[PDB]
């Protein structure tokens, strides 16, 4: 779940508060819709798509699903005791976090006008 996604971000990207990613580009945080403003927005776009596919698994809710993971000594791991849904979600978030750690950060792309550039 997001609390866990939060904690994931905090362990792969220490130097940056997770908030920095809760309202960025067209896909990070807010809804979505439109061409990703950049790579960091692309990471999120791919993260939004991942959730939508997961939503296909019945009774699977990307935001509230509590999965099993762990982050130690710079390693983010999705555990084996997860059902199909939790596993999927975990991996979505996991891929995203790792994606975040490798993408640049443009401050101009933080909290841009969604309505005029993407709703």
């Amino acid at each position: 779940n997001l609390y866990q996604f939060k904690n994931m971000i905090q362990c792969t990207v220490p130097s940056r508060s997770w908030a920095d990613f809760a309202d960025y580009g067209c896909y990070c945080g807010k809804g979505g819709s439109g061409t990703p403003v950049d790579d960091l927005d692309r990471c999120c776009q791919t993260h939004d798509n991942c959730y939508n596919e997961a939503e296909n698994i019945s009774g699977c809710r990307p935001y509230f699903k509590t999965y099993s993971y762990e982050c130690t000594q710079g390693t983010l791991t999705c555990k084996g005791d997860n059902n199909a849904c939790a596993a999927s979600v975990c991996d979505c978030d996991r891929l995203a976090a790792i994606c975040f750690a490798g993408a640049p950060y443009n401050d101009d792309n933080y909290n841009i006008d969604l309505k005029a550039r993407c709703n």
């Binding site: 997001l2 996604f5 997770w18 896909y27 993260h47 939004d48 959730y51 935001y63 995203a96």
Partner: peptide, 5 residues
């Protein structure tokens, strides 16, 4: 209380 993605 609120979201990333």
């Amino acid at each position: 209380l609120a979201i990333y993605s």
